[PDB]
């Protein structure tokens, strides 16, 4: 047989992210003494576009607490933030869109984004266009806060973890049809070599497990076990159920 | 090529300097009889640096 | 080219290009619009025509009146 496309992808080499001309790593401002007690004030210098990200980014300039200059942070932009806004990242921060406060401080029912999976992780959950997490409940004895991830799954994260108030901007980007293959090529060129996609039933027996016969058929069931081998997991992995259904 | 390097030019200039026939007096001194250098190269039929 | 000026060699048989290609119907518009906007502007500056009329006439000129 031949190594399949999935196997060839993990060595990078042509399938590595097209990261040239990307602004930088969008991350929440680092936790600092002035964040832990009180709030640091930043000004949104610019709202720009990341090459591979649908959501707009934002250059917010905070003062340098450590020294004498000014430090620039790159943040995923909540909708409604504007150039020349004053954004406060702190334990004592007001509940306005853009501000970063610890999740215990954030009240229940609040739309939050760029939430930290664990305190001082500088950003993890709810970072894509339109996506948000909501505060569900706070256990003040366990210092833990339940949040609902955009998937629906409920995660108990430390009350110390920080989040930016608001819903990420770029909302409703996938509503528009791509319409042409060309529009897809332009989107993927800013991302990685994953497009165009050839179906395995199109490929010859060597190239893919679905492979090929006199007629294009999946042969055995597409469902594969979770404990498949690395070149064998190709169809629906560990499917609990398959098929279109109600709900 | 017009934008060559001195180190490529100097190894090429050795070949131009040594693409010479045996001096006639050398044939007479050594009774060589064979008067062809045989290490001589003609640009069109040759591929130096290959 | 002296005959052409008189109008000797410019008939339908001697034309090999579309009327828009021979003379662009866009460059004929720019000229007319400029010529008429120059006339109306001078009249407004001279006080011959009112500011309000100038606007009404300016729109009708833009509307191929």
């Amino acid at each position: 047989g031949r190594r399949i496309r999935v196997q060839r992808k993990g060595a990078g080499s042509v399938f590595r992210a097209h990261v040239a001309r990307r602004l930088g790593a969008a991350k929440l401002r680092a936790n600092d003494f002035a964040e832990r007690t009180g709030s640091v004030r930043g000004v949104v210098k610019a709202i720009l576009h990341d090459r591979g990200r649908g959501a707009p980014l934002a250059r917010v300039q905070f003062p340098n607490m450590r020294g004498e200059g000014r430090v620039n942070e790159l943040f995923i932009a909540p909708e409604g933030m504007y150039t020349g806004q004053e954004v406060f990242s702190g334990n004592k921060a007001t509940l306005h869109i853009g501000n970063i406060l610890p999740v215990g401080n954030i009240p229940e029912g609040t739309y939050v984004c760029n939430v930290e999976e664990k305190p001082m992780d500088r950003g993890c959950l709810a970072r894509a266009s339109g996506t948000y997490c909501l505060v569900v409940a706070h256990n003040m004895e366990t210092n833990k806060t339940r949040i609902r991830l955009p998937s629906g799954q409920k995660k108990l994260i430390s009350s110390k973890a920080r989040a930016m108030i608001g819903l990420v901007a770029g909302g409703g980007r996938t509503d528009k049809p791509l319409l042409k293959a060309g529009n897809a090529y332009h989107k993927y060129k800013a991302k990685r070599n994953c497009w165009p996609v050839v179906r395995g039933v199109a490929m010859n027996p060597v190239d893919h497990p679905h492979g090929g016969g006199n007629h294009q058929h999946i042969g055995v069931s597409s469902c594969v076990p979770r404990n498949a081998v690395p070149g064998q997991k190709v169809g629906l992995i560990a499917a609990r159920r398959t098929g279109c259904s109600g709900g | 090529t017009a934008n060559k390097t001195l180190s490529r030019k100097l190894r090429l200039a050795k070949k131009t300097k040594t693409n010479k026939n045996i001096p006639r007096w050398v044939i007479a001194k050594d009774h060589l009889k064979k008067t062809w250098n045989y290490k001589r190269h003609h640009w069109r039929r040759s591929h130096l640096k290959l | 080219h002296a005959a052409k000026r008189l109008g000797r060699h410019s008939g339908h048989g001697k034309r090999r290009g579309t009327r828009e290609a021979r003379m662009p119907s866009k460059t004929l518009w720019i000229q007319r619009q400029r010529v008429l906007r120059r006339l109306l502007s001078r009249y407004r500056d001279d006080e011959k025509i009112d500011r309000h009329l100038y606007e009404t006439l300016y729109a009708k000129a833009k509307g191929n009146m």
């Binding site: 933030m81 020349g84 770029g170 980007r173 | - | -």
Partner: protein, 91 residues
């Protein structure tokens, strides 16, 4: 006038291609993307899209984050209200 009788108003470019469903959807998104929106500061209908999510008011000279195809998205309008109600309630 009314050069295109049906809703092929901005989708005349696509011609006889892509199917009716795609063209109908594109009518709504395209008309929204090239529309002028009212800047919450200039209060003038001069906001136009620069990129997906980035909108600039030509007079106010202020760039604001927004929905990919509209200056303001319905989910966002609701969130701002929920955050305001919760904020006012906390104080």
């Amino acid at each position: 006038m009314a050069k295109r009788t049906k809703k092929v108003g901005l989708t005349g470019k696509y011609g006889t291609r892509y199917g009716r469903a795609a063209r109908k959807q594109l009518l709504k998104i395209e008309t929204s993307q090239k529309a002028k929106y009212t800047c919450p500061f200039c209060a003038k209908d001069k906001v136009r899209r620069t990129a997906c999510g980035i909108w600039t008011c030509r007079s106010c000279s202020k760039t604001m984050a927004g929905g990919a195809y509209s200056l303001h998205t319905e989910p966002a309008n609701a969130a701002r209200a929920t955050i305001r109600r919760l904020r006012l309630a906390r104080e």
